[PDB]
Design a protein around this motif. Structure first.
Motif, PDB file in Angstrom:
ATOM      1  N   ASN A   5      33.490  28.749  36.588  1.00 38.98           N
ATOM      2  CA  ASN A   5      34.592  28.952  37.522  1.00 38.98           C
ATOM      3  C   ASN A   5      34.305  28.283  38.861  1.00 38.98           C
ATOM      4  OD1 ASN A   5      36.862  30.985  36.524  1.00 38.98           O
ATOM      5  ND2 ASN A   5      34.920  31.642  35.608  1.00 38.98           N
ATOM      6  N   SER A  32      36.209  24.984  40.602  1.00 46.95           N
ATOM      7  CA  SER A  32      36.702  24.957  41.974  1.00 46.95           C
ATOM      8  C   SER A  32      36.296  23.665  42.672  1.00 46.95           C
ATOM      9  CB  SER A  32      36.186  26.175  42.743  1.00 46.95           C
ATOM     10  OG  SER A  32      34.843  25.985  43.155  1.00 46.95           O
ATOM     11  N   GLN A  65      38.251  20.937  40.894  1.00 50.65           N
ATOM     12  CA  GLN A  65      39.641  20.995  41.333  1.00 50.65           C
ATOM     13  C   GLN A  65      39.783  20.502  42.768  1.00 50.65           C
ATOM     14  OE1 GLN A  65      40.561  25.162  40.340  1.00 50.65           O
ATOM     15  NE2 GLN A  65      42.059  24.413  38.845  1.00 50.65           N
ATOM     16  N   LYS A  66      38.849  20.887  43.641  1.00 51.48           N
ATOM     17  CA  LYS A  66      38.884  20.401  45.015  1.00 51.48           C
ATOM     18  C   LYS A  66      38.680  18.892  45.068  1.00 51.48           C
ATOM     19  CE  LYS A  66      37.556  24.514  47.653  1.00 51.48           C
ATOM     20  NZ  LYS A  66      37.790  25.545  46.604  1.00 51.48           N
TER      21      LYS A  66
END
Lengths: 49, 49
Positions: free
Chosen positions: A3, A7, A10-11
């Motif tokens: 997870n 992040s 995704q960032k």
């Protein structure tokens, strides 16, 4: 970690997308700035001549 | 904005050129009137001669 890794991934996609989006706007700005400058000055030079 | 800015410059040239054309047209009429008066003097002077 998965997870948290997503992040960061995704960032990175958002940051990478911003660079790609800015590249398209940068090319459009440079292509327009060259025409607005080469045209506004070319016509003015002809009037002065 | 490029065509709009250039359009304003082209429109201004017509106004600037129109001002000089008005003075040239008025000068042509004034010069033409002097030619008519000069022609009358030549005919009158030649006739009197």
């Amino acid at each position: 970690d998965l997870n948290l890794e997503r992040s960061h991934a995704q960032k990175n996609e958002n940051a990478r997308q911003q660079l790609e989006r800015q590249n398209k706007e940068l090319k459009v700005k440079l292509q327009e700035m060259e025409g607005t400058v080469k045209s506004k000055y070319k016509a003015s030079i002809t009037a002065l001549e | 904005a490029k065509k709009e800015e250039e359009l304003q410059a082209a429109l201004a040239r017509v106004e600037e050129e129109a001002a000089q054309k008005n003075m040239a047209l008025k000068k042509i009429r004034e010069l033409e009137s002097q030619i008519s008066e000069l022609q009358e003097d030549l005919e009158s002077e030649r006739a009197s001669r």
